[PDB]
DNA sequence: CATCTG
DNA sequence: CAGATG
């Protein structure tokens, strides 16, 4: 946890480098099993040897580890680091739109750069645009103080729209976090369910309204029961306006909302625990659903969710404010 | 995993 | 339809 750190770092750069600059995805699959393990043990790994004794943990790993451990840098390291062509990835990925692959084809095309872009914006597709259009306001974090005002106007539009609307908002801001990075709402309706038959109008007609009064300003994606957006608080009284925000709101059959409110809800280290436990309690969960445990060796059949209080009660556990849901 | 592009 | 991205 700090004991092996520096070790785990490295490995990691390596990794990741070798997923997205080349395409090593095994390389890469390395870098990481080994990381995980070396982030386990217990001591402090004094030697290339020792780490070796790891398993994932190879030659060239081990060879790697040695050299950090001997001098306080790694050649290769170092020698990718600098590179134009591997830092080029790097920074075209951070526009939302643009993944490894993308990366990789601008640069070869002389796209490295931002404005590279923007004389390019003819071979970026729409996801792209925007995601370029709001480079800046995109990496900025959401104060909860805005999250607040947000979660004010879907809340209510959602109900004009309908009465029997179910909207939550999950993610961090849930479990008290100061400010998050974009806002999902979880969303259902009475009418919309596991046999039920669809309802596309169901996410549709809300999706409108939100644009309707301007909250919505983009659409990135908008399929039957995900739309992935771009939104903004009116700017009040000209001076200040705000920043363009994430934005992502998602149908879900009522029948399988709380697994769901939950599963999103995290964190994951909280998750875990929850999900180790519910088992020992004899059971199964997951973003969907909570299953009782065969002894066969498994089974399912869900049981029946009303709110994040009939799941917890079921693995017989201390309902837990969505502050401390934490770990 | 759901959605888009092509 | 494979393959990308979130
Ligand atoms: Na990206
Ligand atoms: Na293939
Ligand atoms: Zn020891
Ligand atoms: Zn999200």
């Given at each position: 946890e700090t004991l092996n750190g520096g070790i785990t770092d490295m490995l990691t750069e390596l990794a990741n480098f070798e997923k997205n600059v080349s395409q090593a995805i095994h390389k890469y699959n390395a870098y990481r099993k080994a990381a995980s393990v070396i982030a386990k043990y217990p001591h402090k790994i004094k030697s290339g040897a020792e780490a070796k004794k790891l398993p994932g943990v190879g030659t060239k790993i081990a060879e790697k580890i040695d050299e950090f451990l001997a001098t306080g840098k790694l050649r290769k390291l170092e020698k990718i680091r600098q590179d134009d062509t591997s830092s080029s990835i790097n920074f075209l990925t951070?526009?939302?739109?643009?993944?490894p692959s993308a990366a990789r084809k601008f640069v070869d095309e002389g796209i490295k750069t931002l404005e590279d872009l923007r004389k390019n914006e003819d071979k970026l597709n729409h996801h792209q645009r925007i995601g370029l259009k709001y480079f800046g306001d995109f990496e900025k974090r959401i104060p909860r103080e805005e999250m607040l005002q947000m979660q004010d106007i879907v809340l209510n539009e959602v109900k004009k729209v309908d009465s029997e609307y179910i909207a939550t908002v999950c993610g961090s801001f849930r479990r008290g976090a100061e400010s998050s990075g974009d806002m999902d709402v979880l969303l259902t309706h009475p009418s919309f369910t596991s046999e039920s038959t669809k309802q596309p109008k169901l996410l549709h007609q809300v999706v409108e309204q939100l644009q309707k009064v301007h909250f919505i300003t983009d659409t990135l994606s908008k399929g039957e029961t995900k739309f992935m957006g771009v939104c903004q608080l009116?700017?009040?009284?000209?001076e200040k306006e705000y920043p363009h925000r994430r934005i992502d709101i998602r149908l879900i059959p009522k029948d399988q909302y709380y697994c769901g409110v939950l599963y999103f809800t995290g964190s994951d280290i909280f998750n875990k625990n929850m999900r180790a436990h519910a088992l020992e309690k004899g059971f199964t969960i997951n973003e969907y659903t909570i299953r009782p445990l065969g002894v066969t060796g498994v089974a399912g059949e869900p049981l029946p969710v009303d709110s994040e209080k009939d799941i917890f009660d079921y693995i017989q556990?201390?309902?837990?404010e969505p502050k401390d849901r934490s770990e």
């Open positions: 951070r526009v939302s739109g643009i993944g009116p700017s009040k009284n000209d556990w201390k309902y837990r």
